[PDB]
Design a protein around this nucleic acid. Structure first.
Lengths: 342, 342, 70
DNA sequence: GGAGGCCAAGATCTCAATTTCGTACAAGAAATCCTTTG
DNA sequence: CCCTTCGGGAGGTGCATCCCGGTCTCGCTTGGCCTCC
């Protein structure tokens, strides 16, 4: 067993963003800042962990292959066990709560459930957050506005039939009236909110049962639109991302891992390099990253990091450096006795 | 299903500009700055994605074939759904979360929606931001000033009757006096906006109300103008734009791109090459671009990707290299199993 | 003298509607752009406030170096 | 006829609003300096 | 082998736009109803 610490940097190839419910507010989409607005955002390690777990699960699927019928051998229970470690069928080895090194049989048989844990079995892979290495490395990306196609390119109207042209005009009229109604309703809501900060308990209760009714009025008016429930000429809210070429310090590790588990992790990273995407807003090619990870280990007994190799994911390829990394990869490729079906 | 990564450069033929509501403010027109106010501007991936999506929409419209009177069989809802991913009917089949192969049938029969996605359906195509190369590749283009045609060329005055000359006199006198009044009230507004920065925010609210009513008085003064509502002679605010010849590194991806969808995307690029315009101020021919992209596929599990070919868009033509890109384009053009209706 | 009104001169050459009405998102003007362009080739070519200009004139950039001076 | 799936319905309510890196430096030698001067 | 000039003087003004339009969701369990086996 060995502890492989992947200490490295993730250079962002296209802006890196994530939606987090706590971080996201009505003011806008903000990254998790671990503090106030004037703080340094961090890409969650949960997102990277889930992405790498999905990559590893795909690697396991490919290694296992497909049945003679061309269907994956995994069922819903096994699939969810390997993907997110949720035992849906209630059939799992309930390891003792106080015995730390429990599931050695399961760990050997299922290297994926070893690297990332299941419910009740501590995972071996610790995926840290991607911390930026600068004071200005994030920005309000995306944004823009959805423009009505026929109001930008007049030529596109030559394809619409006159019935559809009248439909378009009705849509625009409905959009205009819905805008000029919802804006006034929201102005009334804003006035009520302004009166919310000088109210007492009684009038507060009176003037917040009113706000939600104004919201219901907004919803009813939007529903009244016969041709389009939502305005098409919408200004898209920007999303907070890391700038292109952001050097984010990333700290990963595998704990007391057999060479085969580490091989599975390296294979998962290699597969991840095919689509090195972290986070959402993939429509704007967000998430593309290239990362170099110095793979270190701890000396037997001595508290000193040895450098076993390096893992450099780039669009031009994956560079595995270090003999022991190749040894782990081939070892995972060997030991075909893995059992992902139980 | 191949993951095609287009990596390339967009050279600028005429200045590249975009007005994003988030980036632009009252200080002026600014390109989207990546992290900070003092950061390198980037052409949004959103604008490029919308341009390519409209190009692909036109490709699909032409492929399906206009009726005898140049009208596409598609209704308005089909056009909006294909080109903006917005459904006006509301009949678009929302894929409830947890559906296996969610929209695989729609993806198969609607390559365009598979590429550019929809609400609830992930778009395979991710169009990234075009970041510039080098220190200075942007500047305040546009600018100048609207000038009274008759005060620049006196020869235009022989085409005006005495009544029109008197009307011009009235227009100029009205513009002069209204501008004097507007400049006075704007001076008072600027003094108030300089006093804005006082720490007494409770009085900043009243000062903001004062600014709003001052703007209302400006609007009323401008409304009290029989001849011209807007000052004819006025300097045009310049717009920030990438310089001509600016090289912008650009990256797009198509994850799990079938040959049909990939061919549709290449055809979209080909059609976009006819009008290679990216952004606004087209009055000054802004947006013209010559882009060259290398298409590289990455078989998951392989350390290195393989270059399928290169797409080069220039004013002299579209050069597509590699038998793979031609094969994908031909496959898209020959496949007759697409139904973009709903 | 020309038959055009002064407002028409300004609309044609500078795209300023001094009369004081030219919206952009007028729903009834969604399709009036096509007929307006057909009947007014100049306004189609050089757009106006609310109507895109079909003609886009780029910048003139010197080919060589030191091609400018005081 | 039992046994999977898809949909609708179920109580009222939680509080918070964000603003732009660092400034100026330069030692004892093969050198090419050189090549003189001529 | 001379000996490199004086200074004049350095703008006046315009005018600084209008408008859109800010989304769905869903984080649970149960039974009724639909077709499937």
């Amino acid at each position: 067993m060995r502890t492989l610490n992947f200490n490295g940097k993730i250079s962002t190839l296209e802006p890196l963003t994530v939606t987090v419910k706590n971080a996201v507010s009505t003011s806008g989409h903000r990254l998790p800042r671990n503090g106030g607005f004037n703080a340094a955002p961090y890409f969650p390690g949960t997102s990277i962990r889930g992405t790498l777990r999905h990559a590893a699960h795909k690697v396991i699927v490919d290694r296992v292959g497909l049945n003679a019928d061309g269907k994956s051998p995994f069922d819903l229970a096994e699939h969810f066990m390997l993907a997110q470690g949720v035992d849906i069928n209630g059939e799992a080895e309930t390891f003792a709560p106080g015995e730390i090194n429990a599931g050695a049989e399961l760990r050997s048989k299922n290297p994926l459930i070893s690297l990332f844990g299941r419910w009740g079995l501590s995972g071996k892979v610790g995926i840290g957050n991607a911390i930026p290495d600068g004071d200005n490395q994030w920005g309000m990306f995306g944004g823009g506005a959805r423009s009505i196609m026929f109001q930008r390119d007049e030529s596109l109207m030559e394809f619409l039939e006159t019935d559809q042209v009248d439909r378009l005009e009705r849509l625009l009229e409905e959009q205009a009236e819905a805008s000029v109604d919802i804006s006034q309703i929201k102005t009334e809501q804003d006035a009520l909110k302004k009166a919310m900060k000088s109210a007492d308990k009684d009038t507060k209760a009176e003037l917040q049962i009113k706000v939600r009714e104004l919201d219901e009025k907004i919803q009813a008016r939007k529903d009244q639109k016969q041709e389009s429930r939502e305005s098409i000429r919408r200004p898209i809210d920007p999303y907070e991302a890391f700038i292109t070429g952001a050097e984010l310090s990333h700290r990963m590790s595998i704990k007391n891992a057999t060479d085969e588990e580490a091989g599975l992790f390296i294979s998962a990273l290699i597969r991840f390099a095919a689509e090195p995407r972290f986070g959402g807003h993939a429509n704007h090619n967000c998430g593309l990253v290239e990362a170099h990870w110095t793979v270190t280990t701890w000396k037997p007994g001595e508290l000193v990091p040895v450098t076993l190799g390096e893992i450099v994911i780039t669009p031009n390829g994956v560079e595995i450096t270090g003999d022991e990394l190749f040894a782990m990869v081939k070892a995972f490729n060997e030991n075909q006795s893995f059992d992902f079906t139980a």
